[PDB]
């Protein structure tokens, strides 16, 4: 394969004659395609966070576990998301959505979830107070594309509703290989934290997983179909 | 012409890129250290298990019967150490496989550098 070009077909995958292994590469035989000297490794880290949310009940689409992309409420009018605690906010961008960490001193006071279509009115590091609005839900607010939601909780008072969500999302990171390095784990690997992914000549370049997650392999030096 | 023959024969096997080179060397050393670890496993010498693995690799019956008419018996001292190394738990087993692969890598490396 020309350097830099990834493989459209995965590792340890059966291929039929005529099928492309790559943009300029066509298979001459039926068999099992195998990666040879991958130029890059892709580690998808699992990030899990238990958070909170407050939405009018008129809006709410009532659901036990929300899948990625699934519709969360309808939000009739644009809605200020009002902080139920007091602290310094930590604004973290996750793709479409946001996370707001309310922190006093060191330990955190609260954890707030901001789905897609609920827009943040505050800034990272800024100080907020009880009742001071944070986000603004504009219509809609379907759940994020890469993130799922499990173990919902329901607290209802009048119009408002308060929900604690167990959130599961994938934070991808790309790791560059070297000729001095070698990949230990297979394709579509089930991997834990602090585990060696790609060994090397020196422990320095050794790839160590920062979190429990899934391992993908990309950009082979060549593809051997057997 | 024998020279033509051999030159073409080695002309068949390609060269080795830096990646391949380093990887093969690595696999070889891993194989050797696996043999040493197996020496700590069953309590037998390195070259012993080494030559056994070779006897399982670079030919079935041909390594034994003709380095001269007398060496180490085929059904007897080869196969019993084979079966003795067969009867170990998982780690020593994966190290057996690793050792074999190391031997193969050694062979290929030898060819390009031929």
In angstroms, rounded to a whole number, what is the distance separating the alpha carbons of residues B111 and A207? 32
Judge whether A224 is closer than 8 Å to chain B, CB to CB: no
In angstroms, rounded to a whole number, what is the distance separating the alpha carbons of residues A205 and A215? 17
- Name the token pair of A58: 């008129």
Tell which residue, A89, A56, A85, A90, has the closest CA to residue A72. Answer: A56
In angstroms, rounded to a whole number, what is the distance separating the alpha carbons of residues A79 and A190? 41
B23 and A180: CB-CB below 8 Å? no
Helix (H, G, I), strand (E, B) or coil at B113: coil
B interface with A, Cβ–Cβ < 8 A, is 17-20, 22-23, 26
Eight-state DSSP code of residue B12: H
Enumerate the residues of chain B whose CB falls inside 8 A of the CB of residue A182: 23, 26
CB A143 within 8 A of CB A116: yes
Residue with tokens 């119009």: A159
DSSP-assigned letters across all residues of B30-80? HHHHHHHHHHHHT---HHHHHHHHHHHHT-SSHHHHSSSS-SS-IIIIIHH
Tell which residue, A33, A37, A30, has the closest CA to residue A22. Answer: A33
CA separation, residue A181 to residues A209, B13, B21, B76 (Å):
16, 24, 12, 42
Q: What are phi and psi of A52, to 5 degrees?
A: -130, 160
Handedness of CA A81, A87, A92, A93 (dihedral sign): positive
- Name the token pair of B20: 């391949």
The structural domains of chain B, ordered by start, are: 1-114 (1.20.120.1810)
CB < 8 Å & 24+ apart, contacts of A89-95: A89/A122, A89/A123, A89/A124, A89/A125, A89/A126, A89/A127, A89/A128, A89/A134, A90/A124, A90/A125, A91/A120, A91/A122, A91/A123, A91/A124, A92/A124, A94/A144, A94/A146, A94/A147, A94/A169, A94/A171, A95/A144, A95/A145, A95/A146, A95/A147
Furthest CA-CA distance within chain A: 68
Chain A residue at shortest CA distance from B27:
A182
The resolution in Å comes to: 4.0
CA separation, residue A122 to residues A138, A161, A164, A220 (Å):
16, 22, 21, 44
Tell which residue, A54, A10, A19, has the closest CA to residue A188. Answer: A10
Handedness of CA B6, B12, B13, B19 (dihedral sign): positive
A221 and B19: CB-CB below 8 Å? yes
Residue B11 falls in which region: left (phi positive, over 0), alpha (psi -120 to 50) or beta: alpha
Enumerate the residues of chain B whose CB falls inside 8 A of the CB of residue A221: 19
Q: Which residues contact A189 (CB under 8 A, 6 or more apart)?
A: A214, A215, A216
The nearest CA of chain B is from the CA of A180 a distance in Å of: 7
Cβ atoms < 10 Å from Cβ of B46:
12
Chain B residue at shortest CA distance from A39:
B19
B18 and A179: CB-CB below 8 Å? yes
Q: Which residues of chain A from 18 to 37 reach within 8 Å of chain B, CB to CB?
A: 37
- Cα B13 to its chain centre, rounded Å, is 19
State which approach was used to obtain the coordinates. Answer: X-ray
CA separation, residue A73 to residues A148, A150, A173 (Å):
15, 16, 32
Mutual angle of helices B90-112 and B46-57, in 10-degree steps: 70
Residue with tokens 């009532």: A62
A37 and B18: CB-CB below 8 Å? no
A180 and B26: CB-CB below 8 Å? no
């Amino acid at each position: 394969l020309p350097a830099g070009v990834d493989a459209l077909v995965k590792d340890g995958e059966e291929v039929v004659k005529g099928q492309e292994l790559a943009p300029g590469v066509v298979s001459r035989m039926d068999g099992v395609a195998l990666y040879r000297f991958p130029r890059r490794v892709r580690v998808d880290y699992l990030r899990k966070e238990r958070a909170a949310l407050r939405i009018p009940l008129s809006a709410w689409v009532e659901k036990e576990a929300y899948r990625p992309g699934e519709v969360l409420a309808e939000l009739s009018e644009p809605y200020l998301f009002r902080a139920e605690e007091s602290g310094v906010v930590e604004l973290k961008d996750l793709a479409e959505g946001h996370l707001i960490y309310l922190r006093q001193e060191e330990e955190v006071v609260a954890r707030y979830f901001l789905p897609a279509g609920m827009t943040p009115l505050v800034v990272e590091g800024e100080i907020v107070e009880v009742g001071q609005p944070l986000a603004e839900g504009k219509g809609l607010l379907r759940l994020p594309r890469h993130m799922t939601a499990k173990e919902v909780e329901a607290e209802e008072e009048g119009d408002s509703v308060h929900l604690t969500l167990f959130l599961e999302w994938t934070e991808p990171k790309d790791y560059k290989v070297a000729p001095h390095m070698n990949v230990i784990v297979p394709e579509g690997a089930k991997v834990q934290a602090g585990e060696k992914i790609v060994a090397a000549i020196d422990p320095e370049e050794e790839v160590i997983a920062e979190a429990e997650g899934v391992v993908h392999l990309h950009e082979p030096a060549s593809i051997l179909v057997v | 012409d024998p020279v033509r023959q051999y030159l073409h024969e080695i002309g068949q096997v390609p060269l080795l890129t830096l990646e391949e080179e380093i990887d093969l060397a690595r696999k070889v050393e891993e194989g050797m250290e696996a043999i040493k670890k197996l020496s700590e496993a069953t309590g037998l010498d390195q070259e012993l298990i080494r030559e056994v693995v070779r006897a399982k690799i670079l030919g079935t019956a041909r390594i034994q019967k003709i380095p001269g008419l007398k060496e180490k018996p085929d059904p007897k001292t080869v196969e019993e150490v084979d079966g003795k190394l067969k009867s170990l738990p998982k780690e020593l087993k994966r190290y057996l496989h690793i050792a074999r692969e190391g031997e193969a890598a050694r062979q290929h490396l030898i060819e390009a550098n031929l």
